[PDB]
Design a protein around this nucleic acid. Structure first.
Lengths: 94, 97, 107, 79, 97, 80, 108, 94
DNA sequence: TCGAGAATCCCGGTGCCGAGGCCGCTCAATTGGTCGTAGACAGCTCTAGCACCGCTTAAACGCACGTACGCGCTGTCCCCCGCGTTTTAACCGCCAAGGGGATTACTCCCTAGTCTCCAGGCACGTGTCAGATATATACATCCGA
DNA sequence: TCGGATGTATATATCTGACACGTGCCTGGAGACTAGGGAGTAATCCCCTTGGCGGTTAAAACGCGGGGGACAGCGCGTACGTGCGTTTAAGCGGTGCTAGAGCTGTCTACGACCAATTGAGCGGCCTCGGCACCGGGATTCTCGA
């Protein structure tokens, strides 16, 4: 069979971080994979439009941050911006 | 023994708002899907997943429409659901508008 | 060469920075992709996944269940004000509806 | 073929009970059948357009998912 | 002392304002409201005139369409007067509550 | 700074007349002011986000057009 | 060389095939763009422009005007079923609305 | 100033073809330019999605035709497909 | 308030199939160097956004009256609900056939890329003629009477 | 059922400013190639889709009695529409200043590209325990006294 990639491994890692005893089923994992893909395409498309508006060829952390602020509602946007900024700072430090 | 004309209806409301099953029979829905698809392309095949996705989407759409329809019926100081409520909900949503 | 270290480990994430970078570079989004864009996007995706999974696990525990089923995901999303706003035009298969009977319908 | 009559009155009543409806008029079933037929026609037309573009004779679940996402009715759990 | 019955001038105004394309809100109060709202997002903000004009066009179109939706809810309940409950039902069915 | 009262009652009556409304309740005006404040808050938030991204101090008509397109409210005649 | 002929002349179009090709190539849509894609897109755009402009010119004639204004475009779009479906979530600036009063509100 | 391009002369050419005696204002031409850009973006984005779905790296007239079929309603799609096919055939023959 | 009786729920055994863990292995991500151009930065310039300022005057505001409408109450009656019996076909467990989805190899034609060049399109400048703006007239409609 | 009176449409001047045309230039599209890889075209494999059959029984269809809700009058009070007089900022036209939007020139550092290497993730294979299902008794809601 051909190799079809998904987010199941990372979703399960996050689940075991949050609820170490709780498991997940096949259909719930399909729903979670669909959710991750949907949000990825949303943020990436918004960032692509932002880069096109300002006449730039590069999608940067600024574009992703602005797209997250535009798309995510309220406190979700604030916490996601905190998470992304922390991750980029940690990555640049190392 | 005989229950009054609203008790069993409320019991079924509680029962079907607690479950996640599909409420339409699968074979009639599949036949309807194939019959509708006959008008776009002849000699068509369907994956079981395709018909299952169509049924999930159709049932979700109908349940949401019935929620809006119930809101419209309650707006008119009624408890019975009527076709004009369906039409008002579909017009405000933007479907028949 | 030096021993390979994944970019997710450098960023401290469990979502793939390299795969997300490849998806951005092969998705027809821009001519170029910056070095911090995949890190930011992976962090945001992991945060959202963690939020939904936490709420769904709470629902599963409430229903005396060990496993998450689509019903628990629907219960988690529809009972959160912001996750319901994000997934507003989204249908979750085998999720059902929230129990809600209008007050005028009661005896 | 009158296969729209296979969506019976008890089935529509169950769909109404899940939606919270307590009392139903006798003319609701034909209206519901019409609404369901129109919705299915739109989705199936889009799915078949996707199917013929791919040069296929089989309608896949991904075609349905793309057709629904076009309609603004994203569905999770089938790809 | 000539007097028109209640509703005659209302229908005259309906026809007059459905026949025209002008903006029905005074421009200076709307500009002040827009600047006041934007003060909470960034200080010392400047606005192009076309930006405020675009905002006013969009706001007026939205409000007009919402009033058309509200009138249908008022008529559904067998009324001619639009009430806040009609606005609430219209915005709930639309998906804006 | 109480600029929401500059959307007067006659203006709301005119906007209702263009919407085909014959009779209006007395509590409609406050509800309409709240609705308009919510709508304007959302659109202006998006437009100012677009302006901040461009490292600009002036909110342009394109920012408003993009902000409206984000909500699903495409507007013709102001650029895009 | 040779006398240059625009690709909108070889296709019998009044819309720019070359500019549409450049906008497709520099718009982040696909890695490559075919030779007939700009021609097809320009033909579709020209057809849509022509039909909306025909309806708008009819509306201008009905109002006894020699120029098209946004009101005529709005009347054309909202009076055509397919154009109204295509532009259902679109606001035309200074287009007004369609004259319509409900029957229950009429005096009787 | 700098050169800012628009579909102003082409919309005017089409208008002269359709109604040879009427003109157009600046705001109506702005609306027409916005309409052309909006529909161009809709069709191009649909064709981009279609090519991505089928794992093709080229946008061809088949992608444009299917995007037109999916986006345009009813008779609009049929007549636009006819016009596009006529244009492509004439271009290829010439 | 108070008992039959019915429906949902809550405990105990069964067993079973799907989730979770393990193992090759393969390809996609990582590491280490160039290259060249996208963008960061500094400076100029010169729109256009902002802040008074006075005058009309159009629109907003406040009030008074009354009338049409919103809302509550009452009665009919018929339509929908609940329940019992009969009938139908959905569903489940197998079985068989083959159409078509999916993958692999080869090669050719079609698209990207480069240089030359010149003509299409854009910015500018200008005039005139649709159209906005009075103004008087002519009707179309509304409301007692 | 006819007379007033009110609001809106129509026809004729009359300026005016915006649209349509003409000109110069410049930059982006066309002409003429070259190179390489995307996809079109065969072939093959085997999966999963379609068609068929039988038995159970769950659900649907039909019918019947009755109660309660939809709906049509009827009345009453109030609150919103219409109209008039007073007030107030909106709109307009000019004026001055300068903030910042926009463009240009340098230059550098960051992302694309490429080649080699290896380990993370994916497909396939078990296995047992969480849950679906079965049965019985406790609990609770309903409804006729």
């Amino acid at each position: 069979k051909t190799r079809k990639e998904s987010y199941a491994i990372y979703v399960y890692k996050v689940l075991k971080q949050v609820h170490p005893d709780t498991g997940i089923s096949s259909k719930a994992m399909s729903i979670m994979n669909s959710f991750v893909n949907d949000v990825f395409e949303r943020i990436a498309g918004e960032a692509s439009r932002l880069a096109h508006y300002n006449k730039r060829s590069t999608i940067t952390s600024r574009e992703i941050q602005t797209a997250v602020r535009l798309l995510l509602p309220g406190e979700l946007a604030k916490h996601a911006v905190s998470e992304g900024t922390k991750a980029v700072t940690k990555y640049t430090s190392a | 023994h005989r229950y009054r004309p609203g008790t069993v209806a409320l019991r079924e409301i509680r029962r079907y708002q607690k479950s996640t099953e599909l409420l339409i029979r699968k074979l009639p829905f599949q036949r309807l899907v194939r019959e509708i698809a006959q008008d776009f392309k002849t000699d068509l095949r369907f994956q079981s997943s395709a018909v299952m996705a169509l049924q999930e989407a159709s049932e979700a759409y109908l349940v949401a429409l019935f929620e809006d329809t119930n809101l419209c019926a309650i707006h008119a100081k009624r408890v019975t659901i009527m076709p004009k409520d369906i039409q008002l909900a579909r017009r405000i949503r933007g479907e028949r508008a | 060469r030096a021993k390979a270290k994944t970019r997710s480990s450098r960023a401290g994430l469990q979502f793939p920075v390299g795969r997300v970078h490849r998806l951005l570079r092969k998705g027809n989004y821009a001519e170029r992709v910056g070095a911090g864009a995949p890190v930011y996007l992976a962090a945001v995706l992991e945060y959202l996944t963690a939020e939904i999974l936490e709420l769904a696990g709470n629902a599963a525990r409430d229903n005396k269940k060990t496993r998450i089923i689509p019903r628990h995901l629907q219960l988690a999303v529809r009972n959160d004000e912001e996750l319901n706003k994000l997934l507003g035009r989204v249908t979750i298969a085998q999720g059902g509806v929230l129990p809600n009977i209008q007050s005028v319908l009661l005896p | 073929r009158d296969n729209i009559q296979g969506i019976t009155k008890p089935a529509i009543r169950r769909l109404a009970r899940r939606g919270g409806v307590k009392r139903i008029s006798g003319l609701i079933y034909e209206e519901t059948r019409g609404v369901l037929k129109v919705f299915l026609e739109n989705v199936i037309r889009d799915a078949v357009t996707y199917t013929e573009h791919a040069k296929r004779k089989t309608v896949t679940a991904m075609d349905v998912v793309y057709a629904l996402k076009r309609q603004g009715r994203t569905l999770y759990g089938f790809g």
